[PDB]
Amino acid sequence: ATGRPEWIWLALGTALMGLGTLYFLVKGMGVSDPDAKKFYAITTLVPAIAFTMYLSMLLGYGLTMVPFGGEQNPIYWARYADWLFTTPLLLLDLALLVDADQGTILALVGADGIMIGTGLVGALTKVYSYRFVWWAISTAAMLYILYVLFFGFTSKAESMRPEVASTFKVLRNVTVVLWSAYPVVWLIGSEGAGIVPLNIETLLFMVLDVSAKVGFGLILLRSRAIFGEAE
Ligand SMILES: CCCCCCCC/C=C/CCCCCCCC(=O)OC[C@H](O)CO
Ligand SMILES: CCCCCCCC/C=C\CCCCCCCC(=O)OC[C@H](O)CO
Ligand SMILES: CCCCCCCC/C=C\CCCCCCCC(=O)OC[C@H](O)CO
Ligand SMILES: CCCCCCCC/C=C\CCCCCCCC(=O)OC[C@H](O)CO
Ligand SMILES: *C/C=C(C)/C=C/C=C(C)/C=C/C1=C(C)CCCC1(C)C
């Protein structure tokens, strides 16, 4: 399984996701506040899922070959199985922080499923030019999510506890910057135009994934915003 040069970044990603999961798991022991328990559960599950899918890519299970451009291209399909479940969970963390209404949560999770689903279809599409049609639709769904996080959540966070408002603003900014890089890496990497080779593309996704999941979680789980206001 070491014949693929990208294996070193899959192994590092597996290890870092695993260590993140164990740290959040141990840190969440003894927490009794029901509000904080919700945030620990959502946030510990995110790196646990990513751990299993990085492991499946490392061992070669989460990889398939897709013919396009007259070549058999290696496509790591396990990323989308990871993102299908972990990106909604991350948006739930943000939505619960600001006490978002139920209709807005459904809009966000539904647009997020369309984003990952069409990205998977584009990844597996065999007609080269059609791959970028799905990329554009997926990116439109992303822009909807980013809009809601700015012109819907930021307006309500400012009317809540100051620790909640400040923590949301930081996590919102982290999320908007990190998530926007994903469509760019896909477009210039092996799934799209093929300008960057697969080993470098895999390194880039690994840095983004660990930052968006473990880095995100470290900021959230250290704030007092996840506990209820109590004496
Ligand atoms: C938190 C502290 C850790 C900070 C870590 C942040 C670093 C992120 C790195 C990124 C991209 C690296 C890209 C390396 C590109 C090498 C490609 C290359 O030069 O190949 C030459 C080619 O053969 C002829 O052009
Ligand atoms: C080397 C280590 C590899 C990485 C570890 C293997 C991960 C796969 C195993 C297990 C699922 C464990 C539980 C995952 C669910 C955690 C949810 C949680 O902790 O919630 C706390 C909440 O407060 C309670 O009500
Ligand atoms: C709050 C919601 C919590 C949700 C928790 C769910 C976490 C599931 C994790 C992992 C395994 C993913 C396995 C995906 C199975 C794919 C198998 C498959 O279809 O392979 C086809 C063929 O055999 C080969 O190409
Ligand atoms: C819209 C309301 C919310 C506002 C939130 C602000 C965040 C905006 C950021 C990004 C979108 C992603 C852009 C990806 C498009 C890159 C395509 C490109 O320019 O590639 C050119 C060429 O192919 C290569 O040299
Ligand atoms: C845990 C990993 C995270 C937060 C992954 C985020 C992934 C995305 C925001 C993916 C976006 C994509 C597009 C908008 C278009 C091209 C295909 C995708 C799926 C990479």
Alpha-carbon gap, residue 101 to 15, rounded angstroms: 37
Amino acid identity, position 56: S
Alpha-carbon gap, residue 101 to 95, rounded angstroms: 8
Pocket test for ligand 3, best of 14, 17, 44, 52 (most atoms within 8 A of CB): 52
> Using an 8 Å Cβ cutoff, are 30 and 226 in contact?
no
Of the ligands numbered here, which is closest to the C-alpha atom of 37?
2
Does residue 218's CB lie within 6 angstroms of at least one atom of ligand 1? Answer: no
Torsion angle in degrees (nearest 10) through CA of 165, 169, 170, 171: 100
| Cα of 120 from ligand 4 centre, angstroms | 19
Determination technique for this entry = X-ray
Alpha-carbon gap, residue 13 to 54, rounded angstroms: 7
Tokens matching residue 160: 């809540």
Alpha-carbon gap, residue 219 to 163, rounded angstroms: 13
Residues in CB range of 106: below 8 A, 6 or more apart: none
Closest residue by Cα to residue 20 from 53, 43, 54: 43
> Measured from the CA of 176, which atom of ligand 4 is nearest?
7
For the chain, the maximum distance between any two Cα atoms, rounded to a whole number of angstroms, is: 67
| Cα of 40 from ligand 2 centre, angstroms | 10
Number of H helices, E strands in the chain: 9, 2
- CATH label, 7-226, candidates 1.20.1070.10, 3.40.50.300, 3.40.30.10, 3.30.565.10: 1.20.1070.10
CA 141 to chain centre: 14
